[PDB]
Amino acid sequence: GVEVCVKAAVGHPDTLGDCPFSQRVLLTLEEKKVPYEMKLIDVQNKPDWFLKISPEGKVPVFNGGDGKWIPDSDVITQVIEEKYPTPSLVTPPEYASVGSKIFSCFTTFLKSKDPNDGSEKALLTELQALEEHLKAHGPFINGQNISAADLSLAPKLYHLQVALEHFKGWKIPEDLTNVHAYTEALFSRESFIKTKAAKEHLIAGWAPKVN
Ligand code: NA
């Protein structure tokens, strides 16, 4: 049936790595109960067969059983949605951008070596917006049922929490209680547990970037 190429853990080509875009695709397949074959790609040592179907070395790529491999996890989860419509993970267009600046604010703050450059405040602003959304519309981004936006956001919040605690001793404030309820719900899902990177691999993936 379907096949997906994802990043292997750095230093461990036999082990699932920490790409949040890869994990979004995997989470989507798991939540939809779609069988798939997973191919681990060492992105510092790509195989030539891989380069023939992904010439720019892009990961993830997805083959839905129609004789081609497509990149871009936005595009891939939409194709999966169209081909496997039940369970429905459609997120209403009015909530599509919820949480959309959190990952980049996180990466800027993670890499920041200046306590006064405002990167921390910018990240807290985006977390607070997520908190306000979940307080109005939760427990997931679209209310009682999980949807595509949650599966996009959860791998990203996982990086945020693991990397900021490890490298900066920083945690999401406890008063953001809806965000904490949200991450605890998502990260405890069997699909998430099955598809997440071990924390030491995720940390090893960020270490040279921090650095
Ligand atoms: Na390579």
Q: How far apart are the first and last CA of the chain?
A: 40
- Beta bridge pairs of residue 2: 36
Catalytic residue among 2, 5, 16, 19: 19
Domain 90-211 has CATH 1.20.1050.10: yes
Measured in Å, residue 11 CA sits from the centre of ligand 1 at 13
Measured in Å, residue 43 CA sits from the centre of ligand 1 at 6
Q: In this structure, how many other beta carbons lie within 10 angstroms of the beta carbon of residue 206?
A: 20
Q: Is 12 labeled as ligand-binding? A: no
* Packing angle, helices 148-168 and 20-32, rounded to 10: 140
- H or E element: which one contains 119? helix 119-137
Beta strands in 64-177 (DSSP E): 69-71
Q: In which residue ranges of the chain is CATH 1.20.1050.10 found?
A: 90-211
Taking Cα atoms as reference points, which of 92, 96, 95, 51 lies closest to residue 69? 51
Q: In which residue ranges of the chain is CATH 3.40.30.10 found?
A: 1-89
Q: How far apart are CA 102 and CA 108, in angstroms?
A: 10
How were these coordinates obtained?
X-ray
Taking Cα atoms as reference points, which of 200, 210, 211, 176 lies closest to residue 9? 200
Q: Would you call the peptide bond into 60 cis, given omega within 30 degrees of 0 as the criterion?
A: yes
Pairing of strands 2-9, 61-63: antiparallel
Q: In this structure, how many other beta carbons lie within 10 angstroms of the beta carbon of residue 138?
A: 18
Measured in Å, residue 73 CA sits from the centre of ligand 1 at 21
Q: In this structure, how many other beta carbons lie within 10 angstroms of the beta carbon of residue 109?
A: 21
Tokens of 151: 């599966």
Q: Is 7 labeled as ligand-binding? A: yes
Q: Would you call the peptide bond into 85 cis, given omega within 30 degrees of 0 as the criterion?
A: no
105 annotated active-site:
no
17 alpha carbon, distance to own chain's centre: 12
The CATH fold of domain 1-89 = Glutaredoxin (3.40.30)
Measured in Å, residue 6 CA sits from the centre of ligand 1 at 14
- Beta bridge pairs of residue 5: 39, 61
